[PDB]
Structure formats: C-alpha cells, structure tokens
Write a protein that binds this ligand. Structure first.
Ligand SMILES: Cc1cc2nc3c(=O)[nH]c(=O)nc-3n(C[C@H](O)[C@H](O)[C@H](O)COP(=O)(O)OP(=O)(O)OC[C@H]3O[C@@H](n4cnc5c(N)ncnc54)[C@H](O)[C@@H]3O)c2cc1C
Ligand SMILES: Cc1cc2nc3c(=O)[nH]c(=O)nc-3n(C[C@H](O)[C@H](O)[C@H](O)COP(=O)(O)OP(=O)(O)OC[C@H]3O[C@@H](n4cnc5c(N)ncnc54)[C@H](O)[C@@H]3O)c2cc1C
Ligand SMILES: Nc1ncnc2c1ncn2[C@@H]1O[C@H](COP(=O)(O)O)[C@@H](O)[C@H]1O
Ligand SMILES: Nc1ncnc2c1ncn2[C@@H]1O[C@H](COP(=O)(O)O)[C@@H](O)[C@H]1O
Lengths: 475, 475
C-alpha cells in the first residue's frame, strides 16, 4: 500500500508544478503535493504566482491602465468619450475568472502528463520519506527517490502594522478591494508596493508610499530608478523616502499611521493600508527535526548552484532558496533539477535572469547596472536611446523613457540592458537572448531591426555604445 | 567652382537619409538631394516611410484601434464610457504633427552630422557627375566620388481606377480622409490594403477588399495567413478573393466599381475607393542615357549582393533595387554601402530581414515558411504556442493568435519564426537575434524568459519543436 515515486515535489507554484510536469515528461513517476484550496474548497495549483501574485496583479494593472488612458489620453487621438467610469467589482471579477481558468489549466497539464496530484501538507522526513497530511487529517507516508522542496514564500508581517484583512492588508487583500480607497497608504516602495499603489492611484485613490530607506529601487540602474521615481510621482504616488513606519491605530474604518523622517514624527490617516515590506521563505512544518536539511540565517533552505541541499537526492527551488524571488527563477530551477535527476548537465545562468516591474512605463533589466560596474572597477561604454525619438512610440502616443545598453570598454561585450518604457520586458528579453550568445554591442548594431518598431530603440542604444547611433547625436 | 563630395545620395528616404548620416559619421563629405517639400516649405526628409507611408499608417492604426477597443472591449475590464466618437480631422492632425516632428528630427540629424542637404531633382550623368534641377528650373552639376541611388518607389497606377485624390485615392489620399466613408472599397489585399482598410473599418466604414488573386498573404506562413483572413473578416473587412477590378466610373461623390469573380461581372458602389495594387521603383529622369547603370525587366536598378550597380562607385539601395520593399531593408543597405565605401567588409543577411503587418492582431515573421520548406524538401519539426494559453495575454484581454517556430529536423537549427498576436514584431525580433547567432530550438528553450510576459510564447513554441513545451500538451 506504500506509494513509491521517482520524484516527490512539495508545493505547486511556478517552481513545483513546472518541475513536476518536466519530471513526468522525462519518464519519471512523479507526485506533487499541494495544500492550497480555492473558494470552492478544491485543490488549486499554481501557487502565489497564479492565485494571489503575478497573474492577479497584472490583470488589475492592465485594467486600471486602460481606465487611466481613456480618461486622459484619448482626446489626442480625436476620441471623445462620455464620463469614464470603473465598475471595480467587474474588474476584480475578470481577474478572478482568469485565475480560475489558469489553475484549471495546470490541473489539465498534470493529468495530460501523468503527474500524481496529492492534496495536503507535505513534510520531509529522514530517508527521503514524505509525510502527507491530507485535507481530512489522514496522514500517509510516501517514499521518494528524489525530493524537490518548493514551498515558496509569504508576506512579512511587522508589529507596527499588523494585517487585519480589512483596513490593513497584505498584497492578497490589496487585490480584493471592493471600492477605490479614498486615501491609500502603502508601506514599502518595492516592486509589489509600486504595482499595487499604481492600480489604485489610477482609479482615483490618493496614494502615499512610505519607504524606510533613502534609496528608490536600488536594484535598478540609477538612471532607471531616477526616471521611475519622477514619473510615478507625477502619476499620483506620493513616494516618501526615509519614512519608517513605527506604529498604527485602526479607528473603525480608518487607520492613523505614525512614521519618522528628517522632520521627526509625522501622522497620516488612510482608509486602507497595504503592507508590502517583503516576503520571507516558508518552511513551516516542511522538515522533520532530523531531515538533515540545512536552513541558513535568514530562513532559506541552503543549496548549491544546482539547487541541491545538504541531503543527497533532496533539492530546493524557488522563493524558499537564495536568489531573486521571481516566478521564472523558480520554474527554471525546477527544470534544471529534474534534468540533473535524469543525468543531464543542466545549469542556470543566474547573471541573465531578467527583472520586470509592471508599472507604466514598464521597467525591465538584465545583467549589471552602471553603478555596480563602476563600483567593481570595470570600465564601460554606455549607449542610450530615448523613446521620445522613436517613430513607433510617437505613433503609439507613449514616448516616455529610454533604453540603456552597457558594454565592456575593452571587449565590447554587453554586460547589461536596461529599459524603462513601452514593451520594456520584450526589449530586455532581446538583450538577454543576445547576451546568452555572448553578444558584443557591435553585433547587435549590425543586425536588421524591423522599422517602425519599439525594438529599434534597443538597436539604436547598442549602436550608441560606440558612438554610431543614427537617430541620436553621438558624443 | 563645381561642388565636390565623397558621397552624393539621391533621395532622402530611409535608405538615402540613413546612408547620408552614416557617411558623414565616418568622415565622408556627403550630400543628400531631395525633391519633395512640405506645405510649410520644409524639405520632406524621410521619404515615403515618414511622409506618406510607415509612420502615418501606424499613427492611424494606433488611433483607430483605441477607438475600437473602447467601444468593444472596455466593458470586460469594468470600464464604461458615454458614446465613443471619433473626430477624424483631429486624428489625421495628430498624425500630421508626428510627421512634422520626425522630419524636423532628420533635418536636425543632418545638421549635427554635417550632411549637406540640397533641394532638387538629382540625375546621374556619366562620370559620376550629378545634375540637380532646382524647383525654379535652374540646374547645377556636382561632382561625386561615390553615388548612392535611393529614389524609392511610388504607387502603381492602373487604367481601370485612375486616382483623383478625392473619390478614388491611393495610399497617400487614404491617410487624409476628413470623415469616415460610409462605404469604402480597397483594390488589393496586400499589406498596405489590409492596413488602410482596417483603419477605416474600425471607425465605422463598411469595407470591401477586392483582390484579383485566389491566395491571401501568400508570403506569410499558411497557418498565419489562414488565421489572419479569419480574424480580419470578423473585424469587418469583406475580403473578396478572385475579384479583379476591370473598371470604375465616378458619379459625383460616389464610384461604381465593376469586377469579375466566380459569378462573372459584378458591380458595387463606394463612397471612397483606395487603389493599393502595389508599388513600382522610381527612376524617372534619374539616369542619363550614358550613365552605364543597368535596369532590369521590372524597372529596378540591377545590383549585386553589396548593392553595387554595373558602374564602379555607383550603388543603389532600397525600393529601387531587388528585395523586400521595406524601410529597414533600405536603411541597412544604406549602412552596408557606406561602410564598404570606407573599406569595411560589411554584409547584409537578406535571409533574416523580418516582415511586419500592423493590423490587429499584429503579424510578423522572419526566415522561411513551413510551406516553402516542405516544397524544398527540407524535413522540419514545428512548435506552436497559442496566446490563449498565455497568462500575460489573458491579463491584457488579447489572446488571439499564436507563435510558430520551425527547425531543421536533423540539426534542430531554427529556420523560421512566425507570429500572429500581441507584440508579434518584438517576439519575431527575439527570434531574428537568436537566428543571427545560429540558434537551435533547444538553445532558445534553455534560456530564462521573464514571467509573465508575451515573450514566453516564443519560449514555449521553441520547446514544443522537440515536444518539450510545459504549458501545452505535447502530441
Ligand atoms: C503581488 C505579487 C506580485 C508578483 N508579481 C510577480 C511578477 O510579475 N513576476 C515574477 O516573476 N514574480 C512575481 N511575484 C513573485 C512570484 O509570485 C514568486 O516568485 C513565485 O510565486 C515563486 O514560486 P514558488 O514555486 O517558489 O513559490 P509559490 O508560488 O509561493 O508556491 C509555493 C506553494 O507551495 C505550497 N506549500 C507550501 N508549503 C507546503 C507544504 N508543506 N505542503 C504542501 N504545499 C505547500 C503553497 O501553498 C504554495 O502554493 C509576485 C508576488 C506577489 C506577492
Ligand atoms: C502606406 C504605406 C505603409 C508602409 N508601411 C511600412 C512599414 O510599416 N514598414 C516598412 O518597413 N515599410 C513600409 N512601407 C514601405 C516603406 O515606406 C519603403 O520601403 C521605404 O520608404 C523605402 O525607402 P527608400 O529610401 O527606398 O525610398 P522612399 O522612402 O520612397 O524615398 C525616396 C525619396 O527620394 C525622392 N526622390 C525620388 N527621385 C528623386 C530624384 N531624382 N532626386 C531627388 N529626390 C528623389 C523621393 O521624393 C523620396 O523622398 C510602407 C509604404 C506605404 C506606401
Ligand atoms: N517599517 C517600514 N516602514 C517603511 N518601509 C519599510 C519598513 N520595513 C521595511 N520597509 C521597506 O519595504 C521594502 C520592501 O522591498 P521589497 O522586499 O523589494 O519588496 C524595502 O525597501 C524596505 O526598506
Ligand atoms: N485590378 C486589380 N484588381 C484587384 N486586385 C488587384 C488588381 N491589380 C492588382 N491587384 C492586387 O493588388 C495586390 C497588391 O499587393 P502588394 O503589392 O503586396 O501590395 C496584389 O495581391 C494584386 O493581386
């Protein structure tokens, strides 16, 4: 009666469900354990990303942008509308429908690939045995030749502003508001905070973003974060740096927030408050005391470059291990691990994992920032092209931003591509693909880019590296 | 004394003006001769592409799509408006201001780079001598060490439908309507005809496209053209294949068109008629009898792979020579010619020039079609991914279409990338960049693509080539 599998995956987020599908495709008898259930009380796959993360946030960002554009940027095209209105419930409902479709899609993929789906909480015991606590309390132990831990992360909750799922919410609650909060506060100016604040600012919320640090998007290239702060501020996000929240007091349907900055203590009242101060790895009841799996100082499962833990045949991927907390990072780690289980020498290039921020203008990058390369003493040539000079962007009425390409001054090898503007993620992916092949700035400049397209902005920026751009003056 | 230049470029379109800027950047004393001037007396730099082609069409396509979307696809996002109306004069005026800004931009680039612009009609005489006939009829002969012929193209004019720029227009008049015609006819279902028909259909015109051939977009992959005909028909373009126009009679503010199809002669009346039956190379008074420059059977200037004519030091680029009549082809041929004048061994890869159709959904491709590869006996593996399975596309409410990757069955080398759907041009550019580096489908599949992004559809299609797609069943 004891079930035996070649691979047992704990967690069905982008890391775990992709790993499970890949394992099954490679002929490995695979099981995937997941505890999450939807509103009908049924197993729902896809993790944070699908259910309360990437997908729902992108749906609201696209809907809210259309509303803002209709209100402010239709007249220039000769288009008049009556009063523009937003049925918030319908917007949230569209998002809920997308999530339902996609979670159903993952279940379908599991069935088509032969993945054994097991609803419950999984715990790794000694000897690669996994204890599954089923939805009804029944426990069952299964045996695995290989175990993949992909338990993900959860929002950080801080004593100064505890979430109550009503007036003070985390990112999950922020995607479920029934009405536009008249005054919205956001703690944390990270990617999640800026995305969530953008959604509601577009729909009319007076938005204030309280950020404890004195830097804005420190991971982005300095020129990109400078431009981002300027534009987001103009879009109604009152971004306050050096503003550390120290306490809060919920008074019925409002919250008075206290924070400290260069001018001492300040108080501000909001109708809703979103706490977006980071995410922490989840290992809650994931490991028996004698599992042998090492956890580092910050709660992450310790792994090598191939996602192997301290225990043979046990791997860990995604948000629960070191690295950028991104969905594509999790999925590709899952692929690597399964390929390696099959004996292939798969590996990941952590230096070419792109980052995307889905504000408008979209922000994206891959490789190193200019400030980082200068700090490391690497001499570089930089080429920039603004969308204000792009005929395609002018046609689209979306000319803010630029493309920045950074190359090694001696070898001309492209070390980083940074974009703030239309189709940023797509242009950065072009850069990433070229970088995978060890492209030089000159190699990109020598290629034929379709005209007129936003892609041309990357081509011009690459040419600008060596002072050869056609559509911008060269210095 | 006679003006003397290292390079004399005849024509200031994307081939000519880019060739002029680059020559100047490389230290060559350069002149660019252009005959056309706008209503404000300014030299019409940018040629067909900027003044009456690429840019104006893209501007109207973008404005008209926003109108269609607001009327038909805002409700799903929860967005309501009053009545959505289009001020056609204002839409066309926005386009006119974009054209004015960009033409001014090229003038600024010419000045910053030291290009001597000369207003007039240039003619190549024997001995690389160029006669410029000014607008007042005066002539001046300038001496050149190198001549670049970039005279471009013009619409084909046909006896059955003479253009009067009122009831019967060509592509130039089609971008200037001041009101939506109730009934619009388009002769020719080529790229230009489909784009122009789409603009007006979106704004309420009843559009009929009369095409003499029984094929539709034969240059596109069969799966792409099939989908395109289906979706364009659903958008209100009544595309009639095998319908050859034989005559037309203007009756006041109407035109009765007579055409022949499977039921013999038919008659149909329109308020406006667009003649989009192709384009022809322009060599009108471009060459003296004894210039020595060979013209082929279709009126194109004959050139080798490096755009060199039969006369040493004389080159021809863009629409006036063989190849795809595209802006990026013209510009890159311009760059190749100039680099070679300087002694560099630059080369054009005609196999990797992408094609784009700016309808909605956008269509783009690079490399070979599946039908061509089959006809040539090349064994292939095909991978397809539909946007209906893309989380990013779902969030954007734009899921129509797919990505198709074709690889050599023996070497796995990517031979073609075809896309119909959102950001088709950008995804195709990712494919073209990879193909420049000799990518295999597996190489693309091993790269990390940001999630959620439209780019992921290319990643999945690449994986599907070898039956390894994650998000669609592999059958
Ligand atoms: C609002 C928001 C927006 C985001 N937007 C983006 C974006 O645009 N792009 C991007 O790349 N990333 C984004 N992220 C991050 C992204 O969601 C994560 O990086 C990704 O979900 C990590 O995948 P994972 O598989 O590691 O973990 P998760 O997706 O968190 O999946 C872990 C799963 O394991 C389950 N689980 C945990 N413990 C157990 C157990 N013991 N037994 C059984 N099951 C268990 C959980 O129920 C969960 O379903 C966003 C996150 C948030 C919160
Ligand atoms: C409606 C429409 C839409 C289009 N859309 C696209 C698109 O989306 N993408 C794309 O790639 N292509 C598009 N094209 C095609 C594109 O415009 C051409 O391929 C491109 O302009 C060719 O550039 P060129 O430099 O060869 O010639 P042109 O742009 O035609 O420039 C030739 C110039 O030379 C001048 N000239 C001619 N003879 C002389 C002379 N004897 N002396 C001096 N000057 C002279 C002309 O006045 C003109 O300015 C489109 C065309 C049309 C009509
Ligand atoms: N108490 C706090 N008040 C304000 N900002 C905070 C507080 N605690 C953390 N943060 C910020 O929250 C942000 C979270 O960023 P990230 O992890 O990228 O989402 C960081 O920039 C932190 O400085
Ligand atoms: N008299 C005509 N009636 C209908 N279609 C025509 C006629 N003459 C040319 N065409 C079509 O016009 C199209 C021009 O397409 P292209 O050159 O790609 O822009 C071709 O597909 C021709 O078949």
């Amino acid at each position: 009666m004891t079930q035996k599998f070649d691979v047992v995956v704990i967690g069905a987020g982008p890391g775990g469900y992709v790993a499970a599908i890949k394992a099954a495709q490679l002929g490995l008898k695979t099981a995937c354990i997941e505890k999450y259930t939807d509103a009908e009380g049924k197993l729902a796959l896809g993790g944070t990303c699908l259910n309360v993360g990437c997908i729902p946030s992108k749906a609201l960002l696209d809907s809210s942008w259309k509303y803002k554009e209709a209100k402010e940027s239709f007249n220039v095209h000769g288009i008049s509308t009556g009063e523009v209105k937003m049925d918030v419930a319908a917007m949230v409902g569209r998002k809920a429908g997308i999530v339902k479709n996609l979670t159903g899609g993952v279940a379908t993929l599991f069935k088509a690939n032969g993945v054994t789906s097991i609803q419950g909480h999984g715990k790794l015991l000694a000897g690669k045995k996994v204890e599954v606590t089923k939805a009804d309390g029944t426990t069952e132990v299964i045996e695995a030749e290989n175990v993949i831990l992909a338990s993900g992360s959860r929002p950080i909750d801080i004593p100064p502003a505890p979430v109550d799922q009503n007036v003070i919410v985390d990112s999950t609650g922020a995607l479920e508001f029934q009405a536009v909060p008249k005054r919205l506060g956001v703690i944390g100016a990270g990617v999640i905070g800026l995305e969530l604040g953008s959604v509601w600012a577009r729909l009319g919320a007076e938005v204030t973003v309280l950020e404890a640090l004195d830097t804005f998007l420190m991971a982005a290239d300095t020129a990109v974060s400078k431009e981002a702060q300027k534009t987001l501020t103009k879009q109604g996000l009152d971004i306050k740096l050096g503003a550390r929240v120290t306490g809060s007091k919920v008074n019925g349907n409002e919250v008075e927030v206290t924070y400290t900055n260069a001018e001492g203590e300040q108080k501000i009242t909001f109708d809703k408050l979103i706490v977006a101060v980071g995410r922490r790895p989840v290992t809650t009841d994931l490991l028996a005391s004698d599992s042998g799996v090492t956890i580092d100082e910050r709660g992450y499962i310790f792994v090598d470059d191939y996602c192997a833990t301290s225990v043979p045949g046990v791997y860990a991927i995604g948000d629960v291990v070191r690295g950028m907390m991104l969905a594509h990072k999790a999925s590709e780690e899952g692929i690597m691990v399964v390929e390696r289980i099959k004996g292939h020498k798969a590996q990941m290039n952590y230096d070419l994992i792109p980052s995307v921020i889905y504000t408008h203008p979209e922000i994206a990058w891959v490789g190193k920032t200019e400030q980082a390369l200068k700090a490391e003493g690497v001499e570089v040539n930089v080429g920039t092209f603004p969308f204000a000079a792009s005929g395609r962007a002018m046609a689209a009425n979306d000319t803010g931003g630029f493309v920045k390409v950074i190359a090694d001054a001696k070898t001309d090898r492209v070390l980083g591509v940074h974009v703030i503007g239309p189709s940023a993620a797509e242009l950065v992916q072009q850069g990433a693909i070229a970088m995978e092949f060890g492209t030089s700035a000159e190699d990109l400049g020598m290629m034929v880019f379709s005209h007129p397209t936003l892609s041309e902005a990357l081509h011009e920026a690459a040419l600008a590296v060596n002072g050869g751009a056609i559509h911008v003056a060269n210095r």
